[PDB]
Amino acid sequence: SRVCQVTGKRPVTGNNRSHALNATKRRFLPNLHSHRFWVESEKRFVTLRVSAKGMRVIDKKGIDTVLAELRARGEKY
Amino acid sequence: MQVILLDKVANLGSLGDQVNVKAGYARNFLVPQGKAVPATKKNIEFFEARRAELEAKLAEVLAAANARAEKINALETVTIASKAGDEGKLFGSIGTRDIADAVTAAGVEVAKSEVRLPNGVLRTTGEHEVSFQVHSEVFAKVIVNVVAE
RNA sequence: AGCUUGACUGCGAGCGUGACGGCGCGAGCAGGUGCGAAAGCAGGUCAUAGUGAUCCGGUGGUUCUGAAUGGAAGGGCCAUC
RNA sequence: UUGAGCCUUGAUGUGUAGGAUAGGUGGGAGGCUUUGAAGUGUGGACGCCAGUCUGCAUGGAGCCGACCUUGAAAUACCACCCUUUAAUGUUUGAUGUUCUAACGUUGACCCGUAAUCCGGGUUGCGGACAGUGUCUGGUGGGUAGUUUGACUGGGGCGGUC
RNA sequence: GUUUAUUAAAAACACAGCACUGUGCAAACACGAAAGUGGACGUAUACGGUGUGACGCCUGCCCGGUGCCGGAAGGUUAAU
RNA sequence: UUUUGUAUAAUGGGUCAGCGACUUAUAUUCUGUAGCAAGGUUAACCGAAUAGGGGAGCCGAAGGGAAACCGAGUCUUAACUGGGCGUUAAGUUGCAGGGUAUAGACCCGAAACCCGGUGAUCUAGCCAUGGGCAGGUUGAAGGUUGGGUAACACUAACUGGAGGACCGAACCGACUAAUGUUGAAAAAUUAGCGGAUGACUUGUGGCUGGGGGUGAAAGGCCAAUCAAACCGGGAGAUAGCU
RNA sequence: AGGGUGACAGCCCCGUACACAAAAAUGCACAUGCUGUGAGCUCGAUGAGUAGGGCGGGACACGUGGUAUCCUGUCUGAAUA
RNA sequence: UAAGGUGAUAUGAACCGUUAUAACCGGCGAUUUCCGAAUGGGGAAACCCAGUGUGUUUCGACACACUAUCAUUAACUGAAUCCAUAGGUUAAUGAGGCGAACCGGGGGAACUGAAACAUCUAAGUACCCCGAGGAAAAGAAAUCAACCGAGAUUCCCCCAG
């Protein structure tokens, strides 16, 4: 599903409000992209479904750290 | 993205330099292909520790290489067992090994690669000029005697 | 026609007319003004139409308020849109 | 390639007395030369057609200072500069051309695998485009929720408030 | 041929034929938040949408309005 | 019952028996009544449990002013000869009742709107796999032979067996009339009628689902009432109407 | 207390007040063995794509209001007692 | 615990028992077909059909046991591709389904009220979905206060319509 494997970001719901303040239900989807990360320590690419925010988390922490979070979480990659 | 360059990289900097760069360039090329690393403070301390430890090794090697340059001018004259032919021409020749081994066993531990002769290998009896490279840029001179065995 | 700003500010005994919201008439009192020698007259126009409640917001004023305290924002009050 | 900042470093001056198109302010007695000048033969650019900067070749033992004029000095030379101009170095854009490495592949192939799914891998074709997320202008009876007054010799029309 | 099963079978719908118009294929279009699928194991002599309605003789004028197609200079104009 | 007015030929009731509609909770005010009285009363809770404890609170004995603030006054205005509201009526807590408020708020009753399910055993369209069309006509293309032509054209006989072709049972349909209409039947029966090798008809099973399907298009059909199915729920929707 | 008994029962029956009871399994409690968990001490360390911010929404009694505080779909992004 | 018993309609029959294996009551065991999560595969529930291993004074098929999926772990294996990794088999352990209300969370109406209606209301209600426990959730201040101080969370009464 539309879920970031790094941050957990997922669709959330809310309103479109018109000028006349009519609320209609809507969603806000995360900004997801399947992206291939080079993992040095495993001589391999890992494809993650990540939000752009999630990409910046990986720039900051390093893919090794973030994949370690995936394991501990039981989540497979 | 601040990153610290590993190998030298066009238009950015040399090894160790710190540079800002677009994330996608760092993410999809420079880092995977081993050309740079993030600018984590542990890392920049790593390299500041590196720049300084490297700086110390360069200051002290210069302190060792200068010391040997004071010692080269200290001896300032050397003899070598040299079988000299008639008229003055050496039956053989006096190479860098011959010069090096004189001064090592006469004080200063100069290896032959450090010895620097121009044209000659010295095929004449007499007193000669010899310069040396003990560091990349610090040089000195001994004078060489040729005693006829 | 001359001089002029009473087309004044604060009030108001007592009345009229309204289911109400309201609307009207009012001598007199205080301050200050115009006209008249003076008595006096003037709180718009001979009278009766010419109009839009509240909310929200704008502008000026202000011995009010001011979320720890001093301010400020915002609110009140008075004037007005 | 280019507009707007930067930096080296090079172009450029007709108050008059004159060796004559006097750049102000300073160090200021030797610079400049064979890493090759004076001189003439010509090329270019600027221009007040007075001359100025300047490539090439030729040439081969000089152009030089208080030597006097001029408010201010030697084209012997040197430093921050301005009158303006060019071009190498930089920040941000603008635009374009390529690249490959994100990403796309509903081309071929390999393995998982006696599989027209999927995944990994190879390769070809594209490629920072496409596409998607958030925001934003336009469109939008496709869908949706509603409004669309009262009086009235019935209602509606007309009229009216 | 079809149709209001149960008051209408018809002149209504369809029809072969005609025209306009979209569509270069991962087609347009359609069902689907998506994946997937129909179109089609088709490929412009094909597929969709719209109108007309065998055939014969034919189908004139109007682009101001509304709709659509094309345009880049100017004005106006969103987030930022 | 409803009405200006009903014997009214306006409504409702065949009759009897049983049931069937102004309640309840909490706020609030007034009346009656009781307690205490410038005071009255406690709530949760404690509890020795209808006692007693608990006075946190609430109402009242002070108002005026938007407020600061002043205070039996205050505000208005620079100030009132004054003017507005107040000062000179005892309240409070139970208990019964009258009203109101919030709640279904006196009972019954819509047409409908929303949500989650169940339905293609009827019927629409499609998919796969099977079955069916007595009997009688017409006689396309093609082919052979003959005549014919320079050669084709053409032409006769024969052969051949096309078609949403013709007549007509089964089968599919449903144009007219009578009957029936508390039927034999919630759509038929009788006499006639149209299609009947086709865009035909039919069995078995499958797929499409409700703002959805399907529709040679009638708003037709989707299990005997479809301009939005059925069931359950929001649900006692709402009903200024009867 | 209540019920039953051929009509209404303290004394007919079953009960009730009170007093008692478990071979076995189980609850809960103190005690204790066990495998595991670590106690107190000194010197440290102190939660970053976070707080904050722009855009769109949502939550706070508070409807964008002069609107603090919270959450965050999107773009960003600190200080370090 | 006992002098009466073999549940009911519900008799009868044939029997059991009376001082302690009649019956009756309670604790613990045994047995517990088939369907159903249903779990060897299938399926129109209570049925159809298997593989492997064991057993036959008869070693036939009949009978008995195991064999679903997923997750964690381990052993043995093992590609594209050299190592590796994916994959594959087996074993151990766990989960699955059901069911009142309360409970945390993901989604989330409309009628209705506003005497119409769209902001607003109804209401984070009805409903759908996920998950847990005897309770759940919450919880030891980057909380309040107001210059005095308080000292996590939860619940009740006030503050106050």
Ligand SMILES: [Mg+2]
């Ligand atoms: Mg006078």
Ligand SMILES: [Mg+2]
């Ligand atoms: Mg203002």
Ligand SMILES: [Mg+2]
């Ligand atoms: Mg404050």
Ligand SMILES: [Mg+2]
């Ligand atoms: Mg303050």
Ligand SMILES: [Mg+2]
């Ligand atoms: Mg784009």
Ligand SMILES: [Mg+2]
């Ligand atoms: Mg928008």
Ligand SMILES: [Mg+2]
């Ligand atoms: Mg529109």
Ligand SMILES: [Mg+2]
């Ligand atoms: Mg509409």
Ligand SMILES: [Mg+2]
């Ligand atoms: Mg409505």
Ligand SMILES: [Mg+2]
């Ligand atoms: Mg009317």
Ligand SMILES: [Mg+2]
């Ligand atoms: Mg009909």
Ligand SMILES: [Mg+2]
């Ligand atoms: Mg008919």
Ligand SMILES: [Mg+2]
């Ligand atoms: Mg027509």
Ligand SMILES: [Mg+2]
């Ligand atoms: Mg025409």
Ligand SMILES: [Mg+2]
């Ligand atoms: Mg256009």
Ligand SMILES: [Mg+2]
């Ligand atoms: Mg009447």
